[PDB]
Amino acid sequence: VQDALERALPELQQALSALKQAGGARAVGAGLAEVFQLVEEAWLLPAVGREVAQGLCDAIRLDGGLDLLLRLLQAPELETRVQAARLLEQILVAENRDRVARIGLGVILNLAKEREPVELARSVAGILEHMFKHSEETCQRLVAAGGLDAVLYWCRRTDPALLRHCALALGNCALHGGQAVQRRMVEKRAAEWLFPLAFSKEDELLRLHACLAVAVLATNKEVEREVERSGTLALVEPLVASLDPGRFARCLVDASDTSQGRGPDDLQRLVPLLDSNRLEAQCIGAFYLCAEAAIKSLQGKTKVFSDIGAIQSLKRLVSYSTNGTKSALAKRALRLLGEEVPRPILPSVPSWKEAEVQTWLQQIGFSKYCESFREQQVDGDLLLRLTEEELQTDLGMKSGITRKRFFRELTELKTFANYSTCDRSNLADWLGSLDPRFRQYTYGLVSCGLDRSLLHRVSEQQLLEDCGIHLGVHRARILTAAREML
Amino acid sequence: VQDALERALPELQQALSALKQAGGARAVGAGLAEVFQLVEEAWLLPAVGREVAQGLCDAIRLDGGLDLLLRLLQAPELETRVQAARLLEQILVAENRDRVARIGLGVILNLAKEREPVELARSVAGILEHMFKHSEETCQRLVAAGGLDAVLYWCRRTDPALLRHCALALGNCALHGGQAVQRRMVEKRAAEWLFPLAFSKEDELLRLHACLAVAVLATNKEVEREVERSGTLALVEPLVASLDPGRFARCLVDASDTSQGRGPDDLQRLVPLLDSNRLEAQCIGAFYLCAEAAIKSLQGKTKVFSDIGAIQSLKRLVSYSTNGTKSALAKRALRLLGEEVPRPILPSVPSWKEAEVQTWLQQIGFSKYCESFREQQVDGDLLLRLTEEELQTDLGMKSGITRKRFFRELTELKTFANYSTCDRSNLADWLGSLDPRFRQYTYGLVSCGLDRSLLHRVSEQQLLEDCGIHLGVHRARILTAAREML
Ligand SMILES: NC(=O)c1ccc[n+]([C@@H]2O[C@H](COP(=O)(O)O)[C@@H](O)[C@H]2O)c1
Ligand SMILES: NC(=O)c1ccc[n+]([C@@H]2O[C@H](COP(=O)(O)O)[C@@H](O)[C@H]2O)c1
Numbered sequence A, B: 001v002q003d004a005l006e007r008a009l010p011e012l013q014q015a016l017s018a019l020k021q022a023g024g025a026r027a028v029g030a031g032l033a034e035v036f037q038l039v040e041e042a043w044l045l046p047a048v049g050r051e052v053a054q055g056l057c058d059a060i061r062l063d064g065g066l067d068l069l070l071r072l073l074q075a076p077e078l079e080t081r082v083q084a085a086r087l088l089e090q091i092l093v094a095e096n097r098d099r100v101a102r103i104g105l106g107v108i109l110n111l112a113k114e115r116e117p118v119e120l121a122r123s124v125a126g127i128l129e130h131m132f133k134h135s136e137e138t139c140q141r142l143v144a145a146g147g148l149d150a151v152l153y154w155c156r157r158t159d160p161a162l163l164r165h166c167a168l169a170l171g172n173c174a175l176h177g178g179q180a181v182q183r184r185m186v187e188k189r190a191a192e193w194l195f196p197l198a199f200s201k202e203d204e205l206l207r208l209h210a211c212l213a214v215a216v217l218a219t220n221k222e223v224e225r226e227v228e229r230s231g232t233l234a235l236v237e238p239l240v241a242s243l244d245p246g247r248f249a250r251c252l253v254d255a256s257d258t259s260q261g262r263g264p265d266d267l268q269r270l271v272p273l274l275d276s277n278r279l280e281a282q283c284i285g286a287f288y289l290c291a292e293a294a295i296k297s298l299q300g301k302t303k304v305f306s307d308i309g310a311i312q313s314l315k316r317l318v319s320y321s322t323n324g325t326k327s328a329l330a331k332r333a334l335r336l337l338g339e340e341v342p343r344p345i346l347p348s349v350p351s352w353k354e355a356e357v358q359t360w361l362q363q364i365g366f367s368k369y370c371e372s373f374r375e376q377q378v379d380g381d382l383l384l385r386l387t388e389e390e391l392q393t394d395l396g397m398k399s400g401i402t403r404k405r406f407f408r409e410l411t412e413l414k415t416f417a418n419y420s421t422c423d424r425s426n427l428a429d430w431l432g433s434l435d436p437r438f439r440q441y442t443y444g445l446v447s448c449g450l451d452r453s454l455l456h457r458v459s460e461q462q463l464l465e466d467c468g469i470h471l472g473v474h475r476a477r478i479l480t481a482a483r484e485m486l
Helices: A005-022 A024-045 A051-061 A065-073 A080-090 A096-103 A106-111 A118-130 A136-145 A147-153 A160-176 A179-188 A195-199 A204-218 A221-229 A232-244 A245-250 A264-275 A279-297 A303-308 A310-319 A325-336 A353-363 A368-376 A387-396 A400-415 A426-434 A438-448 A461-464 A472-483 B003-021 B025-043 B049-061 B065-073 B078-089 B092-102 B107-111 B120-131 B136-144 B149-155 B160-176 B179-187 B196-200 B204-218 B223-229 B233-242 B244-249 B265-274 B279-299 B302-309 B310-319 B327-338 B354-364 B367-376 B388-395 B400-415 B427-434 B436-446 B460-465 B471-480
Strands: none
Touching: A005 A024, A005 A051, A005 A065, A024 A051, A024 A080, A051 A065, A051 A096, A051 A232, A051 B025, A051 B310, A065 A080, A065 A096, A065 A106, A080 A118, A096 A106, A096 A118, A106 A118, A118 A136, A118 A160, A136 A147, A136 A160, A136 A179, A136 B003, A147 A160, A147 A179, A160 A179, A160 A264, A179 A204, A179 A221, A195 A204, A195 A232, A195 B025, A204 A221, A204 A232, A204 A245, A204 A279, A221 A232, A232 A279, A232 A325, A245 A279, A245 A325, A264 A279, A264 A303, A264 A310, A279 A303, A279 A310, A279 A325, A303 A310, A310 A325, A310 B149, A368 A387, A387 A400, A387 B388, A400 A438, A400 B388, A426 A438, A426 A472, A438 A472, A461 A472, A472 B460, B003 B049, B003 B065, B025 B049, B025 B078, B049 B065, B049 B092, B065 B078, B065 B092, B065 B107, B078 B120, B107 B120, B120 B136, B120 B149, B120 B160, B136 B149, B136 B160, B136 B179, B149 B160, B160 B179, B160 B204, B160 B265, B179 B204, B179 B223, B196 B204, B196 B233, B204 B223, B204 B233, B204 B244, B204 B279, B223 B233, B233 B279, B244 B279, B244 B327, B265 B279, B265 B302, B265 B310, B279 B310, B279 B327, B302 B310, B310 B327, B354 B367, B367 B388, B388 B400, B400 B436, B427 B436, B427 B471, B436 B471, B460 B471
16 A cells, blocks of 8 residues: 555655755754654554665655755764764665665765774664675675675674674675675684674573574585584574564564565575574574564565575475474474475385385375376385386486476475485495585485595496486596596 | 649659749748748648658658758858758658768868757757767768867756757667777767756756757776766756656657657667666666657557567566656556556575466466476575476477577576575676676576686586586586686
8 A cells, every 4th residue: 555655755845855956963862853754654654664764765765855864964064964974874775775875875884994883883874784785796795895804893782782783784794795795704703793792691692693694694605614613503493492483573573674674585594594504593593584484474574585596495395304493493483384394205215115105105296106106116125216118218307397297396306315224335425525416315325336446437328328317517526526536 | 642742742853943943042031931830831741741751751762852952051141051951851861861971071070060059959959969870980970070079068057958959869879870989989078068957947948858858878898987977967867757657648749840759760779778778778778768658559559569579678678667756657668559458576586386387378378388397396496596497397398499489588598597595605796797698697506606716717528517517618618607606
């Protein structure tokens, strides 16, 4: 409904005109307070708050509002500077951020150099946290300047809002920033600086943000060991298992800085954490996704989770996981969205009998082919070695699209299977080290007698014909990794 | 209707004969005024104006009119010179344009060196603006002479007509002139001289012309950064969102110099702006096309927009855009033409389910194949990897022409899709940097595991068989770009 937007925009235009007509500090402050009140009311509006606040932010984007606020932020009087930053913190949506990045970068960097004032420090922390979510080159230039060191410095204060903003900034730059940024931060010692925040006990939100930042940093293998040595990473898993997503979701809605929740593009960034191969990362990602699902289901906008790929990852995590806390979090999140909860698939595929194959077929939605699979007595050994011709002629999958879907399911089963009963040289982990999506080839190599001590003598033709590696890219990568003597 | 033409020609011939019989300044001026009054009466004629004035121009082209006017323009007396230039400004249609370029170029260049007179300067500005629309070699020779410097020099005056003519000339040379001319102008500092014109407030038409010129200059990436640093470019988008195309279209019709609008070849040059990849360029192009549509629909000549490819571009811009001002302008322009407005297509193709595919199929006009697609359960993942054989055998597109049409649609969907859920190494932007028509290949590479850090080791056979790049030209270009270490 745009009725709130239609009502609010006249008032916003009048306030902007008055601010443009403000020739002194008093009028400037009055106009800034008026516009801040107008935008805050929209940000706290139930259900339609985001759209009817992005509308006013877009309006301010036009009419020269952003440039006027920046110029006021350059004003000699700090009393106006603080209010200008206060308003600039609550408007930096993507459309209002790209302009600031093109124009307003640098001036804010220099302004951040005043590390003494508390209100200015808080507002500037807001600006930086909301700015680190721009393209990775913006992160490069921000870290090159004193922004990263500045937030590093503010980390040692006590007022809660500044610490929470610093933690949010650290998480945002850990996520959006590139691998170089994360390595740079680790060399900056930023991982160790978060330990007091995570171990603190004043607020649970600050601890959650610190754990998120440290986990996202730890996902990167290049610096995983030193990050773990900080000791804060081990504090992640115990924290999530105790907190309740509903209570954590009940919060973030009584507050104003997050009353409306998390956007579609900030949820896209968290989804990969469910695929991070790191237990703490998956746990914290599942916790955050559960909280955001709790918020959005109340907002009645759960469709976003489908467009992001979160439901698929949650179902896969439920199926192919052995831990308890992350499985429970994923199951609760799936139930919140009103989606089904897959039953766990026992991982020892090579030791599967007919019944297991029938159950798996019924799970993946190929129940039309249960009779054909049962007639031919396809078991785990015969399933892991199935081919296109055997699918087409013997099992009866004539349509090539259906066969592609079946192989798409079987590749996920292969990647997330357990080959302990087959490979005694632990060849699955070596393949997973290069790229996790190479773990599907374990059974291909193992059944041919290959081991870690025989790989360096293999050839591309043997991999193509005997081990059944079809894609040339994977063949070349495996050969290059093997010819370096494992 | 040629009745106006048939009436007008006898008078034009009598006036031309009288001018040829003019032996002094007074008779020359009288004949020039008569012919000027005649051509102007035709130019301001509703609906048929353009044709019945082009006929008078062809009449003048023959009978030695153009050579006579040029010789008068060489007359020692400036009183006759100004009128000769005044009449030469209003007759330079393409047929009358090429002749002057072959013959009358150079003399006009020298005459332009009279920077002091106001009337002569105005007429020369008109001549130069209407001449810069000749082949790019004519632009090269004009810039080599003092024409570009002369117009930049007149840009610093105040009389409105001269400034408007200079802005129009600069826009015309930016559009018709080659990339070398644009680079030359940027090095000439031509971008910066436009800032006062765009920031002016006396007339909105001058600001619009300056914004058009600067945007067309900025489309060229080689000089985009320095052009943006001028500061005028950022003033483009705020301007269009406030002006009304109808009022702007209502103007340019009360004026004689544009009473008839823009021609079929001056619109073909604006249409490429909708594909410029620059937000300001697309916004200004959409605004201009909307204004011209408003004019031509009143003239009842909207067919031209189909012959130019403007409707296809407008529909594509409406479908695959996220901005508000340009989308609104495109929708209004489409509605003026009496054409349909496509509903937006959500860009996250990889995350599509069956319903999204059915909607897309119904949009593109392949609703006859909805049942076949639904039966085979084609979704975004299977849609982005569809082939000729699967289309033919499994889905049932027997006619090769229909399959070519379908792939024509799918390639546009692929280029304008959002692969954020797939590519964490942001490989789409690298492909789009070489040529935007390569962004279609993103999902082809990504699904094979390739990244920016693995491209330099790929081979042509891998790009052909695995990544599915059929055209050899694109394969060679991609390999050459990758082997230079990204
Ligand atoms: N994301 C929210 O729930 C929320 C709530 C209230 C205000 N805001 C403001 O919105 C801006 C950030 O917008 P997005 O992060 O949604 O792009 C900031 O100025 C912030 O202060 C966001
Ligand atoms: N394009 C118009 O709407 C228009 C209107 C009146 C006169 N003219 C004259 O026609 C000539 C340009 O012709 P075209 O723009 O059709 O190529 C110039 O001499 C100009 O003064 C053009």
